[PDB]
Write an enzyme that holds these catalytic residues in place. Structure first.
Site, PDB file in Angstrom:
ATOM      1  N   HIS A  41      46.028  41.120  45.853  1.00  0.00           N
ATOM      2  CA  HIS A  41      46.446  41.232  44.453  1.00  0.00           C
ATOM      3  C   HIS A  41      45.657  42.288  43.669  1.00  0.00           C
ATOM      4  O   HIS A  41      45.967  42.497  42.503  1.00  0.00           O
ATOM      5  CB  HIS A  41      46.472  39.881  43.713  1.00  0.00           C
ATOM      6  CG  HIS A  41      45.131  39.264  43.413  1.00  0.00           C
ATOM      7  ND1 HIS A  41      44.357  39.681  42.336  1.00  0.00           N
ATOM      8  CD2 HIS A  41      44.521  38.207  43.994  1.00  0.00           C
ATOM      9  CE1 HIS A  41      43.284  38.906  42.336  1.00  0.00           C
ATOM     10  NE2 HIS A  41      43.337  38.001  43.314  1.00  0.00           N
ATOM     11  N   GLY A 143      36.847  38.410  37.539  1.00  0.00           N
ATOM     12  CA  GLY A 143      36.073  39.387  38.301  1.00  0.00           C
ATOM     13  C   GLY A 143      35.352  38.785  39.501  1.00  0.00           C
ATOM     14  O   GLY A 143      34.699  39.496  40.265  1.00  0.00           O
ATOM     15  N   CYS A 145      37.062  37.289  41.943  1.00  0.00           N
ATOM     16  CA  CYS A 145      38.022  37.397  43.052  1.00  0.00           C
ATOM     17  C   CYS A 145      37.450  38.277  44.149  1.00  0.00           C
ATOM     18  O   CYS A 145      36.853  39.316  43.858  1.00  0.00           O
ATOM     19  CB  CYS A 145      39.379  37.902  42.573  1.00  0.00           C
ATOM     20  SG  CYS A 145      40.199  36.821  41.362  1.00  0.00           S
TER      21      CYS A 145
HETATM   22  C1  QZC Z   1      46.142  32.880  34.075  1.00  0.00           C
HETATM   23  N1  QZC Z   1      45.097  33.475  34.914  1.00  0.00           N
HETATM   24  C2  QZC Z   1      43.917  32.630  35.129  1.00  0.00           C
HETATM   25  S1  QZC Z   1      44.902  35.066  34.880  1.00  0.00           S
HETATM   26  O1  QZC Z   1      43.561  35.352  34.505  1.00  0.00           O
HETATM   27  O2  QZC Z   1      45.998  35.644  34.181  1.00  0.00           O
HETATM   28  N2  QZC Z   1      45.071  35.414  36.434  1.00  0.00           N
HETATM   29  C3  QZC Z   1      46.401  35.482  37.050  1.00  0.00           C
HETATM   30  C4  QZC Z   1      46.299  35.444  38.558  1.00  0.00           C
HETATM   31  C5  QZC Z   1      47.452  35.166  39.290  1.00  0.00           C
HETATM   32  C6  QZC Z   1      47.441  35.164  40.671  1.00  0.00           C
HETATM   33  C7  QZC Z   1      46.270  35.447  41.327  1.00  0.00           C
HETATM   34 CL1  QZC Z   1      46.243  35.419  43.068  1.00  0.00          CL
HETATM   35  C8  QZC Z   1      45.104  35.725  40.640  1.00  0.00           C
HETATM   36  C9  QZC Z   1      45.103  35.714  39.243  1.00  0.00           C
HETATM   37  C10 QZC Z   1      43.813  35.982  38.484  1.00  0.00           C
HETATM   38  C11 QZC Z   1      42.851  34.795  38.585  1.00  0.00           C
HETATM   39  O3  QZC Z   1      43.242  33.655  38.822  1.00  0.00           O
HETATM   40  N3  QZC Z   1      41.554  35.101  38.328  1.00  0.00           N
HETATM   41  C12 QZC Z   1      40.448  34.227  38.227  1.00  0.00           C
HETATM   42  C13 QZC Z   1      39.746  33.718  39.321  1.00  0.00           C
HETATM   43  N4  QZC Z   1      38.725  32.853  39.251  1.00  0.00           N
HETATM   44  C14 QZC Z   1      38.346  32.448  38.048  1.00  0.00           C
HETATM   45  C15 QZC Z   1      38.947  32.878  36.838  1.00  0.00           C
HETATM   46  C16 QZC Z   1      38.527  32.427  35.561  1.00  0.00           C
HETATM   47  C17 QZC Z   1      39.150  32.870  34.430  1.00  0.00           C
HETATM   48  C18 QZC Z   1      40.203  33.775  34.509  1.00  0.00           C
HETATM   49  C19 QZC Z   1      40.638  34.234  35.719  1.00  0.00           C
HETATM   50  C20 QZC Z   1      40.029  33.801  36.926  1.00  0.00           C
HETATM   51  C21 QZC Z   1      44.096  36.348  37.026  1.00  0.00           C
END
Ligand code: QZC
Ligand code: QZC
Ligand code: CL
EC number: 3.4.19.12
Lengths: 305, 301
Positions: A41, A143, A145
């Site tokens: 991603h 960040g 990920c």
């Molecule tokens: C709604 N979401 C949480 S987002 O920030 O828009 N989002 C969408 C998304 C969709 C699909 C995949 Cl595979 C990844 C992700 C990313 C995501 O999960 N990252 C994050 C990972 N770990 C902790 C986080 C703690 C706060 C924010 C993000 C975090 C980013």
């Protein structure tokens, strides 16, 4: 004496963490030999995450679109390929700090250490377990990920997890290092939820044996139970079924303390039906399930890496 | 989201762990530049531990009596000196893996990571706090002496603890890296006991602000308290007195969440009175005191 949630020393993994940037997205990568592994991603944008065709998004990117940073040195990407939900970036330089490693897929209940990273820089290390619902109760921010989960067996690092996303309950979802998700999750912005979680029974029993080894015996009783009677009790309290394999695995701890596994199960049954009554076990008012039988043996024996 | 007890990455410390042997005793040493630091009780012959005269035991030693092993390589000891309860072994090779470092003495309530080692080999890393009674509730077995406590803020490793002994309650005592013990302890096997331990109040308050930041508000109430009325109640639950310094330190968290420190103190008063009533705060059924205000800001923000 003392019983702490202990992680493996993170040094061998620290020497592999890099920053991966593609477009506006920056996350972490694992640099092993001449390949950098990271969530696929990283190629996605705002509209892209909603419904992404990763082969189509990937064919549009060239090697120079991926910026890889190892400390203050930029690595040059010479190739790129996708394996399930992981992107593999071929780089010109082999990592001189590559340890002896394996990619392993773990089962729910098994534990591992997580080296949480931001911008290719490790910030912390913690221990956690793969929940029966395939999520991890981690501690991650945006960040994080690409942060990885691992175990160490002698001098070999077994990489078992790569962080991909956070679910709406605050729990985390990710893949093994071959890009296969743990659980029924997909790497996209959509309605996903963790299933009802259960307690890892074999782990609670192992932690009760750790308490006995450390001198906590108040919960022991004269009673025993059958595996069948205990499993009915456990099913009523959202506990994972205890199998004969679990009973066999607990054998060493049963021999060391003199408490048969079904004798410790009778203690667990009494704790589930009556509570702790204002008491603690190893400084905890809840039954701890993130220590495996092997973690208990390793910490109560002093195995080094 | 999520709140875990997090340790610092141990890599920079792993590259400093060595094995130190003197006669029949083997323990861990910290190799920084051309000096190896280890507990001075490595020169004691068990019986010596009741009333050891370290100056008399050390004067009888030569450089070649100390065997230092860094991995599979033996280091050569070219000098030795004692600084308080630490032995400093001058070696012929500077450690190429020496990170940027400092020796810092911490106050009770401060947290740090411990890299537990046996035979100069690291086995695990965990997060600890200096208890108000100057002990640490660690996880240590025989041979762990010389294991170190540290913080890594930015790229600099601040060494704050070196493990020396286990007290009869299972808790641990040790020194800063200049060999001064934390607490009224001595490197002697005399009758010693940890004083009555107390809860680190400023840390519990910081952890309650971490819970508010993560969306947990069930424990808040409409009340406030004076600092004095809070301490009169807190003392009855074996909680450390909260000082004006503590209140000042909690300022940033109070500004971020919109809850005044004395308002958060009133919630704590109520939590101590009522218990949790089958609820949890950040996955815990007990009030957590091993996260400082600085740790909460570091992890949540
Ligand atoms: C709604 N979401 C949480 S987002 O920030 O828009 N989002 C969408 C998304 C969709 C699909 C995949 Cl595979 C990844 C992700 C990313 C995501 O999960 N990252 C994050 C990972 N770990 C902790 C986080 C703690 C706060 C924010 C993000 C975090 C980013
Ligand atoms: C009665 N003792 C606990 S003892 O084992 O005889 N003892 C006497 C002693 C006295 C003074 C000093 Cl400075 C050191 C020590 C050593 C000591 O505390 N080592 C140990 C350190 N940490 C954890 C341990 C966990 C189990 C055993 C030892 C451990 C050895
Ligand atoms: Cl301090």
């Amino acid at each position: 004496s003392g019983f702490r949630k202990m992680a493996f020393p993170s040094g061998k993994v620290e020497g592999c963490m890099v920053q991966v940037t593609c477009g506006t997205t920056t996350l972490n990568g694992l640099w092993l030999d001449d390949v950098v592994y990271c969530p696929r991603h990283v190629i996605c944008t705002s509209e892209d995450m909603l419904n992404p065709n990763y082969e189509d998004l990937l064919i549009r990117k060239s090697n120079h679109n991926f910026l890889v940073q190892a400390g203050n040195v930029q690595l040059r990407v010479i190739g790129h390929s996708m394996q399930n939900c992981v992107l593999k970036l071929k780089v010109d330089t082999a990592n001189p700090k590559t340890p002896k490693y394996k990619f392993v897929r773990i089962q729910p209940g098994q534990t591992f250490s997580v080296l949480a990273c931001y911008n290719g820089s490790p910030s912390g290390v913690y221990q956690c377990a793969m929940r029966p619902n395939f999520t991890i109760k981690g501690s991650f921010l945006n960040g994080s990920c690409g942060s990885v989960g691992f175990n160490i067996d002698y001098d070999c690092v077994s990489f078992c997890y790569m962080h991909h996303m956070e679910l709406p309950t605050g729990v985390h979802a990710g893949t093994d290092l071959e890009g296969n998700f743990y659980g029924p999750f997909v790497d996209r912005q959509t309605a996903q939820a963790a299933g009802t979680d259960t307690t890892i029974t074999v782990n609670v029993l192992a932690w009760l044996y750790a308490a006995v080894i450390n001198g906590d015996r108040w919960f022991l009783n004269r009673f025993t139970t059958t595996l069948n009677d205990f499993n009915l009790v456990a099913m009523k309290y959202n506990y994972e079924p205890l199998t004969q394999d679990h009973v066999d695995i607990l054998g060493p701890l049963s021999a060391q303390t003199g408490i048969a596994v079904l004798d410790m199960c009778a203690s667990l049954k009494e704790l589930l039906q009556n509570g702790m009554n204002g008491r603690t076990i190893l400084g905890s008012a809840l039954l701890e399930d993130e220590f495996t039988p092997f973690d208990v043996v390793r910490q109560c024996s002093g195995v080094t890496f």
